[PDB]
Design a protein around this nucleic acid. Structure first.
Lengths: 849, 160, 42
RNA sequence: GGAGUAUGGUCGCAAGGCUGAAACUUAAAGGAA
RNA sequence: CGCCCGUCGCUAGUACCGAUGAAUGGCGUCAUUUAGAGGAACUAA
């Protein structure tokens, strides 16, 4: 029986890979995506109000084998307190914010959700995804009303107001107006050459950003019934950034009725522009007319100049918001007469609040002011190393630019230290000190209580300190670096000139031929395993530095080395997707495991056992039994490649930090894992149904004729149409025609043979009713001839024996209509034959000698 | 530069033509759909327009009158394209009715002399003729078989 | 005369006589003809 | 002597395996397919 | 007589995500390219 491992936490991510929706205060609250879950952040306090999680924790028994789908879009409706979350698989979930439960679940999209938009009533939700479809969902019935599928690439943006018209812009460079009455595209224009990334519509103004710096301005005239008049290209203007712009959004001041919009960019900039008022635009037009009169240009030339500059008349560049990080999403949060305020969630895991003070013409301050920031409870750059303290009560995550000490139990950041490019970190005994190794070769020692660096050794190594380890007492340190050396440091306390301060002094150096990637000291301090770029790992006795063994058999360099507690077993995991388990008594290899589809970055034995965790670039954490060399549990909660792994001394929990800026804890649980009808019969039933309907309709028409002639008595009631005919929307003539077409050529003779004589008479009635219709008769003329002639030949004697004046009249009508149609086709063929022969004869006569 | 702008204008005009043809075939307008189909070279759209125009033609004009007038308008390269289409449809027995109807419209509304000195026309005509003769033989045989109804009526009359 | 393959690259011609173009074809239809031509090549 | 057989004698050369790949059922590439 | 159908894999192309980064240019800083990859998509065969 092996204990189950389940995820118990996920902290370290603020906003990641989806747009942020602002929730106004009762600066308000911001809803952001945190990978598989949703965060709500209070801006003024910088605290997480609530977290919405989908269901069962990953790594559980009922969890799916694939990685969870990240939240790819958010759209909140304030009237009903609802929020639509669009995940990466295509799942749209509707959470009521008060109850935090999934009210509605839709799965209509094969790819990631790109944009969601509620209608004003809150009853329909419009969803555009990567699979080039726009789907409208009815929240009342939890169904998909209709799907819009003429786009050749992913829907970048759309706009829908009213139940009549929609406008969509996609990555194929193309914009379409959609009539929702017929679910069909009315007008299709090419917006930009490569892609059409951003769309925003304001009254009769439509703004689209594509792949280039230029932005296109369009007039929307829906009521124009002429084809091509719905969308018109007025002019182009150029924003400064050469990067393409994902999101455009308008907002209007309530009092002054002015409108400002913003164009996001892929870069760090967001460009806010202002539309001038109608009177201001008229005054500018008058000023340009005066300028053209002063210039003396022709009126047609002045008209061309006005058409060229008309893009510059509506818009003026108001300001540009710049941030330290690449921007993922933004939102106009509020507008007053004094300021314009904007919230932006960046690429490197921050939320920033910006304010722009203005006086209706130009902004007062040269740059927008960053008021509030939510950057405390997260990491800016991916975690390269983690360490759980000796008490298992604290965690330390070291990355490029920051070392943060977290409380595991309360899931937040106790302390934050500034540092360099941190490749490896470790705890000194007692949990009071953290030791770091930087890519510059520097070695920094942080103190938790004093909250500052105690000792920094700048020239600890010439090249990057790739790995670092302490002995069991912590008195000695072994640093392995890319300068092809391994240096031993000793910690000793010196009294101040009088508190003792720890100091690290360099004792010994071992110069190897190549780079040292990983270094591990065994728990009993007898063995020192040193990886190399020669794809080999050496093992030294820690006492006397005697060279014991060299373990080889790895194609690519060994990235992680780990030693069991009894020091009988060592594990090397390398970049050739292999975990090799060696015995340290002699150096034989017990096992080689092809574990992941990409490199295994880290491997950690559990304390007091030979089971071990593996941590790889496949974004999978795999728990392994080293007793029978088999994988126990597979953990899939991580989205992208996972860098660091640490195990508690009790073995209760295993912490993993990945590229997706998320730190997760895997805890032991109480549960335990253990390692029909024949052809012809359809014709008779179709004849029964159709001839019954035809005879009923004819009797009803005769009853109406008689009642209208009499002009007295009750009017007869029209018989109800047959349910199959109404459902399929087919006249009985077309229904029996389709049954004849469904009957194959081989079975046809047996079908017509097996029908009895009453069905033969019904067939003749059907044929007469078809003769009444000239389109269907000419569409299926040879089939009708073949079937009717075979029926008459097979049943000639009985049909002759029948003495019915109605049957004689039916045969006369059928004969006349058959011969009329057949001789019409015959006349066409003969005329064409003689004409084409004449044409060929004339050409031969002209070009003959 | 200018050539790239001309290519972009051609691409935009192609997109507008495709959308206009789709709207036309959605709402009827068989003459406009036929003209755009011939300019865009879409044989399925062309065949559907012609066959459904013949559909309302069943209910002297071969098709709808303005469609016939358009076929009279067509130049020699569109004539060659249309006669290739009619030749291929004539190879099939089901789709030969539309081909015969269109060839008859061309013959009635065009000049036979210019039809002769159109280059490559007589190869198409020589391809069309034997299939028309086979179809004429088959339809003539059907008219012959249709007299079983006369025989039935004669026997029914002499019985009663 | 025997109906063969169309001379234009965009045009698709079948032995039925029905001619069809890659521009007018829908994407699902292009998938369907690609698989049908795969079985005919088989 | 010419030409050619036989040889459970002596001596020497052999022959065999998808390669990487073993103390590892172990990667990317191939080799075949 | 007049197109059997669907899924997945395979191949090519285009744009995106973010790490190694590297190289270069302009003023360590900033910008532009490029490579080892991976990740996830849409079209075309």
């Amino acid at each position: 029986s092996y204990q189950r491992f389940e995820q118990a936490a996920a902290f370290g991510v603020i906003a990641s890979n989806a747009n942020c929706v602002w929730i106004p205060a009762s600066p308000g609250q911001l809803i952001t995506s945190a990978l598989e879950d949703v965060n709500i952040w209070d801006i003024k306090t910088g605290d997480l109000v609530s977290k919405l999680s989908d269901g069962l924790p990953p790594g559980a028994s009922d969890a799916r084998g694939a990685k969870p789908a990240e939240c790819t879009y958010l759209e909140a409706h304030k009237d009903t307190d609802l929020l639509a979350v669009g995940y990466a698989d295509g799942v749209i979930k509707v959470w009521d914010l008060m109850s935090k439960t999934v009210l509605l679940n839709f799965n209509g999209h094969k790819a990631a959700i790109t944009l969601l938009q509620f209608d004003g009533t809150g009853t329909r939700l419009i969803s555009g995804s990567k699979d080039s479809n726009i789907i409208v969902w009815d929240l009342v019935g939890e169904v998909g009303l209709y799907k819009l599928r003429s786009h050749k690439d992913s829907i970048t943006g759309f706009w829908c107001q009213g139940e009549d018209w929609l406008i969509s812009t996609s990555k194929d460079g193309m914009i379409k107006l959609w009539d929702l009455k017929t679910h069909q595209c009315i007008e299709t224009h090419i917006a930009h050459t490569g892609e059409c990334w951003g769309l925003a519509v304001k009254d009769d103004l439509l703004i689209t950003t594509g792949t280039d710096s230029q932005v296109k301005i369009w007039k929307l005239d829906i009521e124009n019934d002429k084809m091509g008049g719905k969308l018109t290209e007025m002019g182009i203007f150029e924003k400064q950034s050469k990067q393409r712009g994902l999101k455009i959004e308008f907002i209007t001041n309530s009092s002054d009725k002015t409108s400002f919009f913003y164009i996001q960019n892929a870069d760090k900039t967001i460009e806010t522009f202002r539309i001038r008022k109608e009177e201001e635009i008229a005054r500018g037009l008058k000023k340009r007319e005066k300028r053209l009169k002063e210039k003396g240009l022709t009126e047609e030339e002045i008209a061309k100049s006005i058409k060229e500059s008309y893009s510059s008349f509506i818009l003026h560049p108001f300001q540009t918001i710049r941030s330290l990080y690449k921007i993922k999403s933004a939102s106009w949060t509020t507008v007053s007469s004094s300021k314009l305020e904007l919230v932006l969630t960046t690429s490197s895991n921050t939320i920033e609040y910006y304010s722009i003070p203005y006086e209706k013409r130009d902004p007062t301050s040269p740059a927008p002011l960053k008021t509030h920031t939510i950057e405390l409870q997260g990491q800016r750059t991916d975690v390269r190393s983690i360490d759980i303290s000796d008490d298992n009560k604290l965690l330390a995550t070291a990355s490029n630019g920051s070392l943060k000490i977290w409380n595991i139990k309360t899931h937040k950041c106790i302390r934050t230290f500034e540092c360099g490019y941190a490749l490896t970190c470790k705890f000194l005994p007692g949990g009071l000190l953290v030791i770091l190794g930087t890519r510059n070769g520097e070695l920094q020692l942080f103190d938790l209580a004093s909250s500052s660096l105690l000792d920094t050794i700048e020239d600890a190594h010439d090249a990057a300190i790739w790995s670092l380890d302490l002995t069991s007492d912590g008195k000695r340190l072994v640093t392995g670096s890319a300068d092809k050396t391994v240096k031993f440091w000793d910690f000793k306390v010196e009294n101040s000139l009088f508190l003792p301060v720890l100091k690290l002094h360099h004792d010994t150096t071992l110069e190897l031929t190549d780079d040292i990637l990983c270094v591990r000291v065994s728990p009993d301090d007898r063995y020192l395993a040193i990886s190399l770029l020669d794809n080999t790992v050496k093992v030294f006795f820690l006492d006397s530095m005697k060279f014991y063994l060299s373990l080889y058999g790895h194609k690519l360099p060994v990235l992680s080395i780990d030693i069991s507690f009894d020091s009988k077993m060592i594990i090397t995991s390398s970049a050739d997707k292999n975990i090799k388990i060696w015995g340290l008594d002699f150096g034989d290899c017990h096992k080689s495991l092809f574990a992941h589809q990409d490199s295994i970055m880290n491997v950690k034995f559990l304390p007091q056992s030979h089971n071990f965790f593996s941590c790889s670039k496949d974004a999978v954490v795999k728990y392994w039994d080293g007793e029978k060399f088999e994988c126990i549990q597979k953990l899939y909660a991580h989205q992208s490649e996972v860098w660091a792994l640490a195990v508690a001394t009790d073995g209760g929990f295993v912490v993993s930090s990945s590229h997706d800026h998320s730190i997760r804890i895997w805890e032991e649980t109480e549960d335990q894992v253990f390692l029909s009808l024949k052809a012809g019969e359809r014709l008779m039933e179709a004849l029964d149904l159709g001839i019954a309907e035809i005879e009923g309709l004819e009797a009803y028409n005769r009853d109406m004729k008689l009642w209208q002639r009499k002009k007295l008595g009750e009017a007869p009631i029209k018989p109800q149409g047959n349910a199959v005919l109404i459902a399929v929307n087919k006249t009985p003539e077309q229904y029996i025609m389709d049954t004849l077409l469904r009957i194959r050529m081989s079975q046809l003779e047996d079908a017509l043979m097996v029908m009895p004589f009453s069905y033969v008479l019904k067939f003749l009635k059907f044929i007469d009713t078809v003769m009444q219709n000239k389109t269907l008769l000419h569409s299926h003329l040879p089939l009708i001839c073949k079937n009717l002639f075979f029926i008459i030949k097979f049943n000639h004697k009985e049909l002759v024996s029948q003495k019915n004046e109605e049957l004689k009249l039916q045969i006369n009508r059928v004969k006349t209509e058959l011969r009329s149609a057949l001789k019409s086709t015959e006349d066409d063929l003969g005329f064409n034959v003689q004409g084409l022969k004449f044409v060929k004869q004339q050409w031969n006569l002209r070009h003959n000698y | 530069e200018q050539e790239i702008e001309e290519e972009q204008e051609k691409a935009k005009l192609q997109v507008e033509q495709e959308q206009s043809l789709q709207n036309y075939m959605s709402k009827g307008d068989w003459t406009n759909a036929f003209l755009l189909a011939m300019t865009l070279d879409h044989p399925m759209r062309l065949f559907n327009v012609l066959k459904r125009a013949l559909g309302e033609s069943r209910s002297e004009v071969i098709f709808n009158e303005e469609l016939d007038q358009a076929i009279s308008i067509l130049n020699d390269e569109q004539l060659i394209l249309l006669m290739k289409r009619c030749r291929d449809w004539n190879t099939n027995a089901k789709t030969h009715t539309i081909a015969q109807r269109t060839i008859r419209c061309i013959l009635m509304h065009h000049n036979i002399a210019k039809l002769s000195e159109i280059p490559g026309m007589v190869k198409i005509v020589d391809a069309i003729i034997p299939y028309t003769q086979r179809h004429f033989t088959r339809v003539d045989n059907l008219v012959e078989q249709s007299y079983i109804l006369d025989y039935a009526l004669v026997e029914m009359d002499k019985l009663f | 005369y025997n109906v063969g393959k169309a001379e234009k690259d965009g045009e698709i011609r079948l032995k039925n006589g029905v001619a069809m173009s890659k521009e007018e074809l829908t994407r699902e239809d292009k998938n369907r003809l690609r698989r049908a031509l795969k079985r005919k090549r088989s």
